[PDB]
């Protein structure tokens, strides 16, 4: 571990990892606004016009479609000099569950 | 000292000069001190407009000669030119070309700092995002301040 | 956001009682101006004068051309083979 | 960078009491200017 | 006499040109294909 | 290079007390000039 | 050099003190006197404002130093 | 503060081009040496 007394090792390692959970995480949900929900960020319900355009959503849906139609999944391949049926072992148990 | 005159009576005799003063004094000079109240309540009305720092009298017993004028030193060179233009038709005469020229020039230089201070744009009215070139998009659609 | 934009000029005594002709109810198919005033009749003072849109200097437009072209030069490394191993041979050689 | 930019030419005399309407606020459908002043009235010069 | 309407500021229009240009730069990934890789390889290789 | 960059013409009397407007900053809604001067003054000559 | 400017401007103000008024020569010299007094003042105050608070200093220099200078007032 | 970054689609493309180019351990036999030495040397080194 990082430290002795395990509860301190968790919580102190959490402190150093707080960089991601504060500032970066705040900016990360703002991507998901412009993509999924509404174009404006921190908008209000108004009686006046609020626009949208978004060339971004057709681009995102196009890029997402490429990686889905070409999925990358477990396949396995033998080790260095190993037998050819080696891969089929671990794939046998993979495809069942 | 003497950048601002001690009393409104000293300012009055300066207008009497500009009027005739052939060893005469108009009878509209008595209403010239009253006209200071009217001039400043027409423009500089309600304590706003062209800043002069003028203070108004009770307008009962004082005719603005029983209480302080309250004029600034800078405000002297404006007022007694515009005062001389106003009491001239009241006395059934009309001001000369030098008096009306300086009257407009002193009115303008009195208002110059006021116009400059009121010449500052509003802080982002209606809408304004902070962009992603500045971290934390946060609140947007700023009405003024947010 | 800020900075005066195009709000057409008028004067108080030619829009007097005709500043209720901008209430959006459209009980009028026209606007009007004041013909005369007291003391002496006076026709509107410059009623054809209106605010004109912010142009933005030609310097801003000319500098934008130099801004986009500055990045565009170095974006190209040269081409000696299309895609891979164009101008990037110099990068790839030292890597290996 | 350093030059003055596009602004209307006015005087304090012809913008008095309506200079508050200029600041970029979108709460105005129109702006106003003085038509008269003490002594001779306001000059029509620089209306736009 | 006729009322001259706002034509939309050239400042606002010139800013809208830079607005529409800002978004479409990062939309491109170097992609030139309708499927994975083709200059978007960087995103696909880190997935595998 | 060595020939000065273009600048607007002005005169000392009309820019007096309003040199702050033409200081090279842009945060000002409008410009200000002297309408008249003393000693039988004149209108500001060509600020355009 | 500014003591023979001022009294021309003052001349036309104190000209009515017995109901007299300045001649066309006097107001000409007076207006030129006001022009001279602000002549040396206007040149000294003239100098363009610093670069914007959005303006880069570029990378065409070896060391960029300060950036995002005043433009506020 | 604006953004465009026409820099980024070009950087993404160049990163993808170098990653699809394979620079990895292979080797080749030396002067007067057996060509059967190559696979043996890679045998343990590819396992790790």
Curated annotation (Swiss-Prot), chain A:
It is found in: Virion. Transmembrane segments: none annotated. Forms the portal vertex of the capsid. This portal plays critical roles in head assembly, genome packaging, neck/tail attachment, and genome ejection. Procapsid assembly may initiate with a nucleation complex composed of portal and scaffolding proteins. The portal protein multimerizes as a single ring-shaped homododecamer arranged around a central channel. Switches upon genome packaging from an asymmetrical conformation in the procapsid (PC-portal) to a symmetrical ring in the mature capsid (MV-portal). This change of conformation may serve as a signal for headful packaging. Homododecamer. Interacts with the terminase large subunit; this interaction allows the packaging of viral DNA. Interacts (via C-terminus) with the head-to-tail adapter protein gp4; this interaction participates in the head completion. Interacts with the scaffolding protein; this interaction initiates procapsid assembly, thereby ensuring incorporation of only one portal ring per capsid. Interacts with the capsid protein. Belongs to the p22likevirus portal protein family. This is Portal protein. It comes from Salmonella phage P22 (Bacteriophage P22). The gene is 1. The chain holds residues 5 to 101 of 725 of the full protein.
UniProtKB/Swiss-Prot annotation, chain C:
It is found in: Virion. It comes from the Viruses. Belongs to the p22likevirus portal protein family. Homododecamer. Interacts with the terminase large subunit; this interaction allows the packaging of viral DNA. Interacts (via C-terminus) with the head-to-tail adapter protein gp4; this interaction participates in the head completion. Interacts with the scaffolding protein; this interaction initiates procapsid assembly, thereby ensuring incorporation of only one portal ring per capsid. Interacts with the capsid protein. Forms the portal vertex of the capsid. This portal plays critical roles in head assembly, genome packaging, neck/tail attachment, and genome ejection. Procapsid assembly may initiate with a nucleation complex composed of portal and scaffolding proteins. The portal protein multimerizes as a single ring-shaped homododecamer arranged around a central channel. Switches upon genome packaging from an asymmetrical conformation in the procapsid (PC-portal) to a symmetrical ring in the mature capsid (MV-portal). This change of conformation may serve as a signal for headful packaging. This is Portal protein. The chain holds residues 342 to 437 of 725 of the full protein.
Swiss-Prot record, chains D, F:
It is found in: Virion. It comes from Salmonella phage P22 (Bacteriophage P22). Forms the portal vertex of the capsid. This portal plays critical roles in head assembly, genome packaging, neck/tail attachment, and genome ejection. Procapsid assembly may initiate with a nucleation complex composed of portal and scaffolding proteins. The portal protein multimerizes as a single ring-shaped homododecamer arranged around a central channel. Switches upon genome packaging from an asymmetrical conformation in the procapsid (PC-portal) to a symmetrical ring in the mature capsid (MV-portal). This change of conformation may serve as a signal for headful packaging. Homododecamer. Interacts with the terminase large subunit; this interaction allows the packaging of viral DNA. Interacts (via C-terminus) with the head-to-tail adapter protein gp4; this interaction participates in the head completion. Interacts with the scaffolding protein; this interaction initiates procapsid assembly, thereby ensuring incorporation of only one portal ring per capsid. Interacts with the capsid protein. This is Portal protein. Belongs to the p22likevirus portal protein family.
Curated annotation (Swiss-Prot), chain G:
It comes from the Viruses. It is found in: Virion. The N-terminus changes its conformation when transitioning from the preassembly state to the postassembly state. Monomer; homododecamer upon binding to the portal ring. Interacts (via C-terminus) with the portal protein; this interaction participates in the head completion. Interacts with the Tail hub protein gp10. Interacts with the tail needle protein gp26. Tail protein that binds the portal ring and functions as a head completion protein. 12 copies of gp4 form a structural ring at the bottom of the portal ring. Together with gp10 and gp26, gp4 is required for stabilization of the condensed DNA within the capsid; perhaps by plugging the hole through which the DNA enters. Plays a role in ejection of the bacteriophage DNA into the host cell at the initiation of infection. Functions as an exolysin that catalyzes the cleavage of the glycosidic bonds between N-acetylmuramic acid and N-acetylglucosamine residues in peptidoglycans. This is Head-to-tail adapter protein gp4. It comes from Salmonella phage P22 (Bacteriophage P22). The gene is 4.
